[PDB]
Design an enzyme around this catalytic site. Structure first.
Site, PDB file in Angstrom:
ATOM      1  N   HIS B  41       0.847  -1.115   0.253  1.00  0.00           N
ATOM      2  CA  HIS B  41      -0.048  -0.103  -0.101  1.00  0.00           C
ATOM      3  C   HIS B  41       0.790   1.530   0.013  1.00  0.00           C
ATOM      4  O   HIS B  41       0.301   2.457  -0.007  1.00  0.00           O
ATOM      5  CB  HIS B  41      -1.179   0.189   0.950  1.00  0.00           C
ATOM      6  CG  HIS B  41      -0.559   0.473   2.491  1.00  0.00           C
ATOM      7  ND1 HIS B  41      -0.577  -0.726   3.395  1.00  0.00           N
ATOM      8  CD2 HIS B  41      -0.169   1.469   3.037  1.00  0.00           C
ATOM      9  CE1 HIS B  41      -0.063  -0.119   4.422  1.00  0.00           C
ATOM     10  NE2 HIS B  41       0.176   1.163   4.446  1.00  0.00           N
ATOM     11  N   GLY B 143       2.304   6.270   9.439  1.00  0.00           N
ATOM     12  CA  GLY B 143       3.724   5.925   8.979  1.00  0.00           C
ATOM     13  C   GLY B 143       4.353   4.632   9.997  1.00  0.00           C
ATOM     14  O   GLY B 143       5.623   4.365   9.415  1.00  0.00           O
ATOM     15  N   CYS B 145       3.555   1.628   9.587  1.00  0.00           N
ATOM     16  CA  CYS B 145       3.395   0.549   8.429  1.00  0.00           C
ATOM     17  C   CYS B 145       4.703  -0.017   8.007  1.00  0.00           C
ATOM     18  O   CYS B 145       5.517   0.831   7.597  1.00  0.00           O
ATOM     19  CB  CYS B 145       2.585   1.014   7.301  1.00  0.00           C
ATOM     20  SG  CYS B 145       0.601   1.295   7.916  1.00  0.00           S
TER      21      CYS B 145
HETATM   22  O1  LIG Z   1      -4.578   2.056   8.927  1.00  0.00           O
HETATM   23  C1  LIG Z   1      -3.502   2.620   8.313  1.00  0.00           C
HETATM   24  N1  LIG Z   1      -2.407   2.821   8.967  1.00  0.00           N
HETATM   25  C2  LIG Z   1      -2.119   2.457  10.303  1.00  0.00           C
HETATM   26  N2  LIG Z   1      -1.669   1.322  10.832  1.00  0.00           N
HETATM   27  N3  LIG Z   1      -1.653   1.266  12.327  1.00  0.00           N
HETATM   28  C3  LIG Z   1      -1.828   2.389  12.397  1.00  0.00           C
HETATM   29  N4  LIG Z   1      -2.217   3.405  11.342  1.00  0.00           N
HETATM   30  C4  LIG Z   1      -2.655   4.686  11.306  1.00  0.00           C
HETATM   31  C5  LIG Z   1      -3.578   5.142  12.351  1.00  0.00           C
HETATM   32  C6  LIG Z   1      -4.023   4.892  11.069  1.00  0.00           C
HETATM   33  C7  LIG Z   1      -3.606   2.964   6.826  1.00  0.00           C
HETATM   34  C8  LIG Z   1      -4.584   4.160   6.636  1.00  0.00           C
HETATM   35  O2  LIG Z   1      -5.702   3.537   6.025  1.00  0.00           O
HETATM   36  C9  LIG Z   1      -5.190   2.153   5.792  1.00  0.00           C
HETATM   37  C10 LIG Z   1      -6.042   1.266   4.983  1.00  0.00           C
HETATM   38  C11 LIG Z   1      -5.734   0.101   4.599  1.00  0.00           C
HETATM   39  C12 LIG Z   1      -4.414  -0.307   4.972  1.00  0.00           C
HETATM   40 CL1  LIG Z   1      -3.693  -1.606   4.059  1.00  0.00          CL
HETATM   41  C13 LIG Z   1      -3.492   0.652   5.457  1.00  0.00           C
HETATM   42  C14 LIG Z   1      -4.009   1.911   6.037  1.00  0.00           C
END
Ligand SMILES: O=C(Nc1nncn1C1CC1)[C@@H]1COc2ccc(Cl)cc21
Ligand SMILES: O=C(Nc1nncn1C1CC1)[C@@H]1COc2ccc(Cl)cc21
Lengths: 304, 304
Positions: B41, B143, B145
């Site tokens: 992603h 960030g 990820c």
């Molecule tokens: O959740 C996500 N990042 C994330 N992972 N742990 C914490 N966070 C941030 C607090 C949001 C991103 C944003 O929306 C999506 C949708 C799908 C995927 Cl594969 C990845 C994301």
């Protein structure tokens, strides 16, 4: 989101861990520049620990009696000295892996990461708090002595603790990196009681702010309190008295959440007087006091 | 003595963290040998996340669109490919800091350390458990990820997890190092519910053994139970059913403490039916399930 008891990345400290052997005693040392810092009780046998005369004991030891091994390579000891309860072993080689570092004496209620070590090798890392009674609730087996506690500010490692002993109670006591014990403890196999341990009120408040930030809001009430009224409750429950300095540090969290510090104190008060009623906060059934307001702001902003 | 939620020393994994930028999206990558592994992603904009066609999106990207920075030095991308939900960016330089490593897919209930990272830099390390519903309860901001979960066996790092997303519930979902998500989750900004989360019974039992080893014995009773009778109680309380395999793994702890597994199950049963009555176990007011029997034996023996 999500809130965890997070330790600092331990890499910079792994690079400084060495094994120090003296006679038949082995423990951990901390190698920074051309100096290795270890607890002075490395010169004792368990027999000597009853009432050791460290000055007399050290006098029968030469630079060659201190075996310092960094991984699998031997360090050459060219000087030895005692500073309070630590030994400083001057080696002929500066550690190539020495990070930017400071030796700091932390205050009770402050937090730090411990890199537990055995025979100079790291086994694990966890986040601790220096208790108000100057003990830590660690995980330390025989040979863990010399393991250090530290904090990190971008690239500088502030070494604040060196592990020395487990009290008969099962709690841990140790020194700053100048060999001064935190608390009244002495490095001797004698019964030493730690004082009454209180709960670090400002840290519980900070953790309540972290809970609100992370969605756990059930404990928020329609009440407020004053510092004096709150402290009457905190006294009864062996919580540290809250000062205007503590409220000042809670400022960023009060601003982020929009909840006044005294409002959060009134939620804490109701939680103390009524309990959690089978509910949890940040996956915990008790009030957590090992996150300082700096740790909460840091974790909630991802400082690297 | 003392029992702590301990993470593995993170040094070997810090050395593998890089920053991966694609377009305006930045996340973490894992650099091992001449390959950088990151969530796919990274090629999406938040607009694309509604329903991304990763195959179509990746086709508009060249090796030069993937900016890989290791600290402050730029890595040259010479190949890019998609394996499931991860991108493998072949770089021209093998990471000098690559440790001995394995890619492993762990089972639910197993534990691992997460090195939380932002812009390729480490911020902290904590111990997690893969939940029975294949989510983790982490601490991850925007960030984070690309941050990885791992275990260590002396010098070999078994990478088991890569962080991908936070579900609308606040729990975390991710993949193994081959890009296969743990659970039913897909890398899309769509409502995805995790199943019913159960308590890892064998881990609670192991933590009860760790409590006995560390002096907390109040919960030990004069009762016993059978696997069938225990599982009737475990079912009612959304605990995982205990099998003879779980009892077999608890063998070393049963032997160390001298308390038969079914005897410990009867203590767990009374704790489930009666609660803790305001008491604590290993400083916890709830039953801890994020220590496997291997973690308990390891921490209680100081394996480095
Ligand atoms: O959740 C996500 N990042 C994330 N992972 N742990 C914490 N966070 C941030 C607090 C949001 C991103 C944003 O929306 C999506 C949708 C799908 C995927 Cl594969 C990845 C994301
Ligand atoms: O407590 C000690 N080591 C230690 N520290 N955390 C865990 N442990 C081992 C479980 C005992 C040693 C043994 O007896 C003494 C007495 C005084 C000093 Cl300075 C040091 C020690």
């Amino acid at each position: 989101s999500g809130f965890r008891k997070m330790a600092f990345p331990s890499g910079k400290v792994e690079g400084c861990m060495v094994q120090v052997t003296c006679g038949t005693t082995t423990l951990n040392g901390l190698w920074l520049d051309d100096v290795v810092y270890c607890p002075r009780h490395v010169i004792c046998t368990s027999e000597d620990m009853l009432n050791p005369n460290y000055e007399d004991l050290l006098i029968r030891k030469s630079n060659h009696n201190f075996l310092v091994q960094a991984g699998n390579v031997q360090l050459r000891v060219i000087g030895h000295s005692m500073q309070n309860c630590v030994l400083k072993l001057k080696v002929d080689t500066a550690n190539p892996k020495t990070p930017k570092y400071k030796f700091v004496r932390i205050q009770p209620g402050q937090t730090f990461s411990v890199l537990a070590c055995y025979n100079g090798s790291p086994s694990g890392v966890y986040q601790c708090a220096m208790r108000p009674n100057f003990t830590i609730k660690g995980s330390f087996l025989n040979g863990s002595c010399g393991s250090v506690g530290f904090n990190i500010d971008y690239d500088c490692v502030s070494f604040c603790y060196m592990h020395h002993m487990e009290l008969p109670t099962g709690v841990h006591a140790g020194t700053d990196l100048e060999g001064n014990f935190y608390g009244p403890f002495v490095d001797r196999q004698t019964a030493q009681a730690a004082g009454t341990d209180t709960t670090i009120t400002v840290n519980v408040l900070a953790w309540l702010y972290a809970a609100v930030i992370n969605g756990d809001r059930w404990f928020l009430n329609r009440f407020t309190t004053t510092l004096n009224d709150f402290n009457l409750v905190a006294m009864k429950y062996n919580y540290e008295p809250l000062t205007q300095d503590h409220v000042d540090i809670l400022g960023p969290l009060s601003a982020q959440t929009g909840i006044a510090v005294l409002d959060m104190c009134a939620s804490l008060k109701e939680l103390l007087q009524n309990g959690m009623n089978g509910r949890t906060i940040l996956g915990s059934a008790l009030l957590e006091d090992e996150f300082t307001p700096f740790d909460v702001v840091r974790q909630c902003s991802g400082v690297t």
